[PDB]
């Protein structure tokens, strides 16, 4: 369609299909493998540490149950908010 | 940052800051603003319809309250999952 957010969602669904499109579901996978997707396709857990280190372990906390694209996008978003101080003015 | 899935987050923060960063919060905006953001970020009036309005109507529902970055990313995730049968197998 050639809109800029279409290329964001295209990127997210193509990188999700890089780990789900092996197997019997293309919208879900295990908590274990989404965690792995994030640290491979997004360099962040080497620039940053605090909270990112639990969110990683918080999929792997139960690990081998399924997730949909929601638990993917809230974690990508929540993790972005942990260094989005590039968009603040001050401590608030 | 600079790995392929960043360019999705980079897009989402670049677009969202163009309708939050009108006013004194560069991380929140109204339910009216999220509605404006999405209908300029994507064309939607020609593909899958109608089930795309009760989501936007669910912004109208409380229209003058605020919205965060996460409501924004789960609404777009939800809406992408609501009409990309184009990613599936058929069948359920």
CA–CA separation, A23 and A17 (whole Å): 10
Name A87's Cβ contacts closer than 8 Å, sequence gap at least 6: B13, B17, B21, B26, B27
**Four-residue CA torsion sign, A77, B1, B11, A22:** negative
> What residues are paired with B29 via a beta bridge?
B67
Give the residue from chain A lying closest to B71, CA to CA.
A74
* Residue A70 in tokens: 């929601």
Closest CA to A79 of A52, A45, A56: A52
- What DSSP element (H or E) covers A33? helix A31-41
CB-CB contact of A27 with B87 (8 Å)? yes
- CA angle B28–B29–B34, rounded 5-degree value: 120
Name which of B41, B77, B87 to mutate to probe chain A: the one with the most chain A Cβ atoms within 10 A of its Cβ.
B77
| CATH number of the domain that residue B15 is part of | 1.10.238.10
First to last CA, chain A: 37
Q: Which domain holds residue B53?
A: 1-92
Three-state DSSP class for B30? strand
Name the residue facing B69 among A15, A77, A88 (closest C-beta).
Answer: A77
Q: H-type helices in B2-85, by residue range?
A: 6-20, 31-41, 53-60, 69-81
φ, ψ dihedrals at B30, nearest 5°: -75, 170
* Residue A18 in tokens: 């890089």
Instruction: Please state the domain count of chain A.
Output: 1
Name the residue facing A27 among B11, B72, B81 (closest C-beta).
Answer: B81
CA–CA separation, B81 and A69 (whole Å): 8
């Amino acid at each position: 369609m050639e809109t800029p957010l279409e290329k964001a969602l295209t990127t997210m669904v193509t990188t999700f299909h890089k780990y789900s499109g092996r197997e019997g579901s293309k919208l879900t996978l295990s908590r274990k493998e989404l965690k792995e997707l994030i640290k491979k396709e997004l360099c962040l857990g080497e620039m940053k540490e605090s909270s990112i280190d639990d969110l990683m372990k918080s999929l792997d906390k139960n690990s081998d149950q399924e997730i949909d694209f929601k638990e993917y996008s809230v974690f990508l978003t929540m993790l972005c908010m942990a260094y989005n101080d590039f968009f603040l003015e001050d401590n608030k």
